[PDB]
């Protein structure tokens, strides 16, 4: 037991391989869904049958402080015209010891949206560019 090794939501490690995107700073929305189909039996009141049908992986929003290395992301996104590349990503959650609690690796990524910084003279914060990521499956 060793007083267990509980999960946490601060220590992590977010990275994208391939183009020199580097390490990100915040994940969101990592989710897998299936699309159940509801067929209602006519002669048996009481419930609707639930039958599984396919699985579907939702998009992921990754955020990081606006660093001068943001030119790489715009280069990657605007490379669709001349040919794109799908590198392999990773999303890992850690405890403060630096050990591993669960490691997910995105099979193939693809940019979807890039919400840039929201400049504002009165708001004291730090610009957080958002890079949405498309998905193809988990790794194992």
């Amino acid at each position: 037991m060793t007083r267990k090794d509980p999960g946490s939501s601060i220590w992590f490690s977010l990275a994208i391989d391939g183009e020199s995107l580097g390490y990100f700073n915040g994940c969101e929305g990592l989710s897998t869904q299936v699309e159940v189909e509801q067929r209602q039996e006519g002669g048996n009141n009481g419930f609707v049958w639930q039958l599984p049908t396919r699985v579907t992986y939702s998009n992921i929003r990754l955020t990081r402080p606006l660093t001068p290395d943001t030119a790489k992301v715009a280069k990657w996104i605007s490379s669709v015209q001349t040919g794109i590349q799908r590198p392999t990503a990773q999303i890992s959650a850690l405890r403060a010891d630096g050990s591993l609690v669960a490691r997910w690796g995105l099979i193939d990524v693809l940019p979807v949206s890039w919400q840039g910084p929201s400049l504002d003279p009165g708001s004291a914060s730090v610009a957080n560019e958002v890079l949405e990521i498309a998905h193809h499956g988990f790794t194992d």
């Binding site: 006519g42 002669g43 048996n44 009141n45």
Partner: protein, 37 residues
């Protein structure tokens, strides 16, 4: 249209449209006065 089928197959809720058209009932079997104008 049948809906809400009960157990053992008997229908329960049924909606039935109807189209009706009338049938004629025919064959039900000139003095005038005079005014100054």
């Amino acid at each position: 249209q049948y809906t809400l089928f009960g157990t053992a197959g008997v229908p329960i809720r049924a909606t039935c449209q109807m189209g009706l058209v009338e049938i004629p009932g025919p064959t039900p079997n000139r003095v005038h006065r005079v005014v100054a104008g």
